[PDB]
Design a protein around this ligand. Structure first.
Ligand code: HEM
Ligand code: HEM
Ligand code: HEM
Ligand SMILES: [Mn+2]
Ligand SMILES: [Mn+2]
Ligand SMILES: [Mn+2]
Ligand SMILES: [Mn+2]
Ligand SMILES: [Mn+2]
Ligand SMILES: [Mn+2]
Ligand SMILES: [Mn+2]
Ligand SMILES: [Mn+2]
Ligand SMILES: [Mn+2]
Ligand SMILES: [Mn+2]
Ligand SMILES: [Mn+2]
Ligand SMILES: [Mn+2]
Ligand SMILES: [Mn+2]
Ligand SMILES: [Mn+2]
Lengths: 158, 158, 158, 158, 158, 158, 158
C-alpha cells in the first residue's frame, strides 16, 4: 500500500537507531559475560533481542508501505571501558531513540498513519522500560558501592 | 588467555563478513515474505539466524583471546531486485566467506590455535551447506521455469 | 542341504542382477537428491533397499543349498544424464531381471525345488511393482510435461 | 560447488574401497550365520551397514563437489575358508583402507578442503574401531583356543 | 594396531600432566570444602573428574597403539596456601598443559595420526575452558575484593 | 579440630597406599578391556573407584584433623604381564594394605580417636572383600584351567 | 539386663551433658531467629534436635541396663552476648562432651559393654560433625568479616 514518504524516512531513521542498539547491547552482554558478570549478560542479551524484534517490525512496515529498508548505514557505537561507563552509553542511546520516536509518532499522527503511529508507541513503551532498568542499575551502583554491585551480578536472577 | 594478534584479526574480518550476511539474508527473507513467497522467507530467515549464531561465536572467541570484537564496520550489502538476482547475491557472499575462512583456518593452524581452527571448520561446514541450498534453488529455477518455481514457494515445506 | 547345481547358478545370476540394481538405484536416488528432486530421491532409495533385501535372500538360499554366493562380478551400470533417461534405464534393468526370473522360476520348478521357486515368485512380484511405478512416472512426464513433472518432485509425498 | 579434481579422485578411490568392504563383510556375516555362529553374524552385519553408510557419505560429497561417483569398479574380494582366515582378510582390508584414508586426509588438507577432510577423519575413526574389534577377536582365538572361541559365538551378546 | 613411537611418548607425557592435575585439583577442592567455600569445592572437584576422564582417554589410546601407559611418574604438585595462590597454581598448570598439547597435536598431525590428533584437540578445548574459568575468578577477586569474593563461595551456584 | 600427629601420619601412609591401588587397579582394568576380557575390566574398574572413594575419605579426615594430605608420593606399581600375574599383584597389594590398616586401627584406638578408627574398620572391611574376590578368581583359574577361565570373561556378569 | 554400675554412671554424666547442649543450642537458635539471622536459627535448631535424640538414646540404654536416668541435674549454660561469643560457647561445650565421651567409650570397652560403646562412638561421630560446623563458621567470620558474615545469614541455605 503506498505510504507517506516522510513516514517511510522516519521509519528508516528509527530502524537505523535499532541497528546500533542491537550491536551495542549484544557486545556489552558478551563483555559482561566474559567478566563473569552473568546477571548483566542475561539482561543485556535480552535487550539486544528486543531491539532485534523492533528492527524486524520496522523492516516489515517499510516493505508494506512500499519503501526500502536501509540496513546499510550503521551509526557510531559507543562501547565503554568499565561497567558504569557501559551502562551509561546504553542509557544515553535509549534516551536519544526515545527522542526520535516522540518526533516520528507526532508526524505519523499528523499524516493520519495511525497504524505506523501505534506501532511506534508500542516500541516507545519498550524503550521507556529499558530506560527504567538502566537508571535503577546506575543508582544501585552509587548506593551499594561498586564491589557490592559486582558481587550481585555473578549469579543469575529469577 | 592471550591470543595471536593475526588470529584475532582473521576472527574480526570473518565477524565482519557475518554482519553483512545477517543483514542481507534478513532483508531478503522479509522481501520474499512481503511478495507472498513463504518457503523462501522461512529458509532465508533461518540462514539469517545461523549467521547471527556464527557472529556470536566469533565475539565470544575474540573476547576470550583478549581481543576486541569489531561490530562497527558493516560492508556493502548487495540486495537485488528479483528472486534470482537476490539468490545469486547470497551465493556470491557465501562463496567469498568460504574463501576467507579457508585462509583463516590455515593460519590458525600454523600458529597452533587448534581450538579457533576447529571453530572455523564448523562454521565452514555450515556455509558449504548454505552454498548447496542456494545452488540447487538457482538450478531448479532454470529447470522448472520461473512461474513454476514461484508457485512452489507459496506454501511452506516440512 | 545339497542343492541342484543349475538352481545354484540361476540364483547367482539373479544375485548378480540385484548387485547392479542396488548400485544403479542408489546412485540415481542421490543424483535426484542433489538436484532438489526429493520425492524421486525417496522412492529410488526405497527401491535400492528392496534390492538389498533381495540380494540378502539369494545369499542366504545359495549358502543353505551349499553353493557359493558370487558378490565379485558387477555388471554394467547404465546411469543416464537426465531425469527421463535415468528412469528409462531403471525400467529397462527391471524388465531384464523379470525376464531372467521367469526363466529361473520355471527351471527350479522342473527340478522340484519348490521353496527356491516360491522365493523367486515373491521377488518377481516386487519387481513387477517397481516396473509399474517406473512406467507410470514415464507416462506422467509425457502427460503433464517435464516442468510440471519436476515441480511435483520437490516436496515429499505420503 | 566446484571441488578440487584430485580430492574428487581420492573420494572415488575411497568409495571404491567401501564397495569391497560392504560385500566382503556382508558375505562373511551370512557365512557365520549359516555356520551357527550368531555373535559373529551380528557384529559383521553391523560392520557391513557402517560401510554402506560410509559409501553413502562419499557419494553425496562427490555429487556436491560436482564430480561423478564411481559405483562401477569393484575390487577383489578375499573371502577365506575358515573363521580365522575370514577375520584376517577383514583386518587386512581395514588396514589398507586406513592407509588410503591417511593419504587422502593429508591431500584434502593441503588444498584447504577442510569439510572433506573432517568427513574422512570421522570415517577413519570408525575404521580404527573395526580394526580394534578384529585384532581382539584374532587374539582371543589364540588365547582361549578355537573350540572355546567357536562355543562363545553361538548365542548373541548385549 | 602399531602406533608411532613418538606419538606414544607425547601421549604418555600428556598422561603424566593429567596425573598431577587430578591430584592438585582434587586436593584444592577438598581444601576449599574444609574452609566452607562450597562453590569452589564443586567447580574444582568437577575439574578433577574431567582430568580423570582425560587420563582414561590417553590410557586407552596408548594401549590400542600398542604402547605402555606410564602411571608411575607423578610430577610436582604446587598446592598453595591461600585461595588466590591456589587458583594461580591451577591456571599455571593448565597453561603448561595447553603448551604441551599444542606441540603434541602438531606432531601427531605430521605423522598422519589424525585420530590421536583429534582426541587431543578435544582435550585442548576442555583445557581452554578451565583456563577461562580460572582467569575470570582471579579477576573477580581483584574487582569485588577478597571478602566479597569469599562470601560469594559459601552457597552453591546453579 | 587438632588431631594426634601420629594418627595423621598413619592416615597419610594409608592414603599413600590408596594412591597406588587406584593407579594399579585402573591400568589393570583397561589392560583387561583391551584384551577383550570385559568381566575383568568391569570388576577391576569398580575396585579402582572404591579406592578413589577411600582416598577421598582420608583426604577429608586429615584436613579436619588439621593435617596436610600427601598426594605427592606415589609408591611402586607392580603391573604384571599376564592375567594371573596381574591378579596376584593386586592380591599382594591388598594384603599389605590390610596389614598397615590393622596397625593404624590399633594406634587410633590407643589414642582414643574412635571416629578415625571406625573409618578405618569400614575401609578394612571393603579391602577384605576385594581380597575375597581376588583369591576366588585365582583359584578358579587353577580349577577350570586358563582357556576356560579366559572364555568366561568375554561377556559381562550381573 | 543388669549393667555395669560405672557404665551406668558414665551414661548419666553424658546424659547430663546433653541436657545443657539441648537448652543452650535451643536458646541460641531462637536468639539468632529474633535477630533476623535465619540460617543460624535453622542450623542451631537442628543441633538442638540432635542432642534431644542423643538424650533419648541414653535414657533408653540406662533403663535397659537397669539404672535410673538423671534428668534432674542441669549444668551451667553459657549463653553469650554476641554471635561470635555464642558460637564459641557452643564449640567449647562440644569439645568437653567429646572429651567425656572418649573416656566413657574406653571404659565401656574395658568392661566388655560393646553395645553401649558402639552407641557412644555413633554419638561421638555426630559431635565431631557439630565441632566441624562451629569451627568453619568461626573462621568464616574472621575471613569475610562480621558485616559480610551477618549478611549471609538472613536467608536460609539448602
Ligand atoms: C539486522 C539486525 C538483526 C535482526 C533484524 C535480527 C533479528 C533477530 C530475530 C527476529 C531473532 C529471533 C528473536 C526471537 O527469539 O524471537 C534473532 C535472534 C538472535 N539474534 Fe539477531 N538480529 C539481527 C542482528 C543480530 C546480530 C548482530 C547478532 C549478534 C551476533 C544477533 C544475534 C542473535 C542471536 C544469538 C539470536 C538468538 C538465536 C537463537 O538461538 O534462536 N542478531 N535476531
Ligand atoms: C552386497 C550388496 C548389499 C547388500 C546385500 C546390502 C544389504 C543391506 C541390508 C540387508 C540393509 C538393511 C535393510 C533394512 O533396512 O531392513 C541395508 C541397508 C542400507 N544399505 Fe545396503 N546393501 C548392499 C549394498 C549397499 C550399497 C552399495 C550401498 C550404497 C551406498 C548401501 C547402502 C545402504 C544404506 C544407506 C542402508 C541403510 C542403513 C541404515 O541406516 O539402516 N547398501 N543394506
Ligand atoms: C589414575 C588416575 C585416576 C583415574 C584414571 C581416575 C578415573 C576416574 C574415572 C574414570 C571416574 C569416573 C568418572 C565419571 O563420573 O564418569 C572417576 C571417579 C572418581 N574419582 Fe578418579 N581417577 C583417578 C584418580 C583419582 C584420585 C587420586 C582421586 C582422589 C581421591 C579420585 C577420586 C574420584 C572420585 C571421588 C570419583 C567419583 C566416584 C563416584 O562416586 O562415582 N580419582 N575417577
Ligand atoms: Mn528499540
Ligand atoms: Mn531499548
Ligand atoms: Mn556464517
Ligand atoms: Mn552462510
Ligand atoms: Mn530385485
Ligand atoms: Mn526391482
Ligand atoms: Mn568404511
Ligand atoms: Mn571398517
Ligand atoms: Mn586434562
Ligand atoms: Mn583442565
Ligand atoms: Mn582402599
Ligand atoms: Mn582394595
Ligand atoms: Mn550430643
Ligand atoms: Mn553436638
Amino acid at each position: 500500500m503506498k505510504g507517506d514518504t516522510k513516514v517511510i524516512n522516519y521509519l528508516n531513521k528509527l530502524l537505523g537507531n535499532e541497528l546500533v542498539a542491537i550491536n551495542q547491547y549484544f557486545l556489552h552482554a558478551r563483555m559482561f559475560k566474559n567478566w563473569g558478570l552473568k546477571r548483566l549478560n542475561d539482561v543485556e542479551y535480552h535487550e539486544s533481542i528486543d531491539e532485534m524484534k523492533h528492527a524486524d517490525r520496522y523492516i516489515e512496515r517499510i516493505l508494506f508501505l512500499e519503501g526500502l529498508p536501509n540496513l546499510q548505514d550503521l551509526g557510531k557505537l559507543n562501547i565503554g571501558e568499565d561497567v558504569e561507563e557501559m551502562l551509561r552509553s546504553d542509557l544515553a542511546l535509549e534516551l536519544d531513540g526515545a527522542k526520535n520516536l516522540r518526533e516520528a509518532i507526532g508526524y505519523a499522527d499528523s499524516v493520519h498513519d495511525y497504524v505506523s503511529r501505534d506501532m511506534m508507541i508500542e516500541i516507545l513503551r519498550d524503550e521507556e522500560g529499558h530506560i527504567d532498568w538502566l537508571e535503577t542499575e546506575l543508582d544501585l551502583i552509587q548506593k551499594m558501592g561498586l564491589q557490592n554491585y559486582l558481587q550481585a551480578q555473578i549469579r543469575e536472577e529469577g
